[PDB]
């Protein structure tokens, strides 16, 4: 009795599963590529983390997240890959429960984790309280098209500081202020939809995880969690926050999905 987990979101969530490749299964949650590939984080990700370490049961990974994407390009664009993209690759080969993903409310849960470019692209070029409230109301719209498909089980995952990865830092501070600033609406809006949507639908699970705290935490006392400092990079992933300038690695993302595990109880994998 297997979850099906699929994901949408960008680079802090791609594997480059393809779904021409080869699928999921119980021998191979992941489906493609094998786990510990084709992510920013030089090993597994969350969700690569959360699908083969941190499950309590049998987690299914189609992992449509790709590198670069915005909500839709429609508002802020970015690469062809946005969210909007990957809802269609969604609607166009598991939408309809395939044998190959025979998903049913019970036991499919769909995770977001977008608006890190959308932010990234129009911090500085538009007004927080006006204009993020459009990005949140596509976000929704694309949610529905799952919803109408018969989707149930939804995890959204807020946007982490990136106003201070070492990228970020070296614009100076009164941008990283002015990127935090925006952010935190950005936030505020995403949490406002998600509670409206639970609340209206009646019947969905719904579990709005809060990246931002967490990273922050360990941004402010990095030694705390082993890292020697909250700035310095290193493409092993381990021994810093950062892997690249503003992407973190796996040790991070492997606290990050401790984190979640017992907030993703109620969504049946964990």
């Given at each position: 009795?297997?979850?099906?987990?699929?994901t949408?979101?960008?680079s802090?969530?791609?594997?480059?599963?393809?779904?021409?490749?080869?699928?999921?299964?119980?021998?191979?949650?992941?489906?493609?590529?094998?786990?510990?590939?084709?992510?920013?984080?030089?090993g597994?990700?969350?969700?690569?983390?959360?699908?083969?370490?941190?499950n309590?049961?049998?987690?299914?990974?189609?992992?449509?997240?790709?590198?670069?994407?915005?909500?839709?390009?429609?508002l802020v664009?970015?690469?062809?890959?946005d969210?909007?993209?990957?809802?269609?690759?969604?609607?166009?080969?598991?939408?309809?429960?395939?044998?190959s993903?025979?998903?049913?409310?019970?036991d499919?849960?769909f995770?977001?984790?977008?608006?890190?470019?959308?932010?990234?692209?129009?911090?500085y070029s538009?007004?927080?309280?006006?204009?993020?409230?459009?990005?949140?109301?596509?976000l929704?719209?694309?949610?529905?098209?799952?919803?109408?498909?018969?989707?149930?089980?939804?995890l959204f995952?807020n946007?982490?500081?990136?106003?201070?990865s070492?990228?970020?830092?070296?614009?100076?501070?009164?941008?990283?202020?002015?990127?935090?600033?925006y952010?935190?609406?950005?936030?505020?809006?995403?949490?406002?939809?998600?509670?409206?949507?639970?609340?209206?639908?009646?019947?969905?699970?719904?579990?709005?995880?809060?990246?931002?705290?967490?990273?922050?935490?360990i941004?402010?006392?990095?030694?705390?969690?082993?890292?020697?400092?909250?700035?310095?990079i290193?493409?092993?992933?381990?021994?810093?926050?950062?892997?690249?300038n503003?992407?973190?690695?796996?040790?991070?993302?492997?606290?990050?999905?401790?984190?979640?595990?017992?907030?993703?109880?109620?969504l049946?994998?964990?």
């Open positions: 009795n297997p979850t099906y987990f699929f949408f979101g960008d802090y969530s791609q594997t480059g599963f393809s779904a021409s490749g080869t699928q999921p299964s119980a021998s191979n949650p992941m489906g493609n590529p094998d786990l510990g590939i084709g992510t920013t984080t030089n597994p990700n969350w969700i690569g983390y959360l699908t083969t370490t941190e309590a049961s049998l987690v299914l990974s189609y992992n449509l997240a790709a590198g670069g994407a915005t909500i839709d390009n429609a664009p970015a690469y062809p890959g969210l909007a993209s990957q809802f269609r690759l969604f609607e166009d080969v598991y939408a309809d429960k395939p044998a993903a025979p998903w049913s409310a019970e499919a849960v995770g977001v984790w977008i608006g890190i470019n959308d932010i990234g692209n129009a911090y538009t007004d927080a309280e006006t204009y993020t409230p459009k990005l949140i109301s596509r929704e719209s694309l949610v529905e098209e799952v919803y109408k498909n018969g989707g149930r089980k939804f995952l946007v982490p500081p990136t106003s201070r070492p990228l970020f830092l070296e614009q100076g501070e009164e941008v990283v202020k002015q990127h935090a600033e952010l935190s609406v950005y936030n505020e809006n995403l949490e406002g939809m998600v509670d409206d949507f639970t609340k209206k639908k009646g019947d969905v699970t719904t579990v709005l995880y809060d990246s931002w705290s967490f990273m922050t935490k941004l402010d006392d990095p030694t705390a969690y082993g890292f020697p400092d909250a700035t310095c290193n493409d092993d992933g381990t021994s810093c926050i950062w892997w690249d503003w992407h973190p690695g796996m040790k991070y993302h492997l606290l990050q999905a401790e984190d979640m595990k017992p907030k993703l109880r109620k049946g994998g964990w």
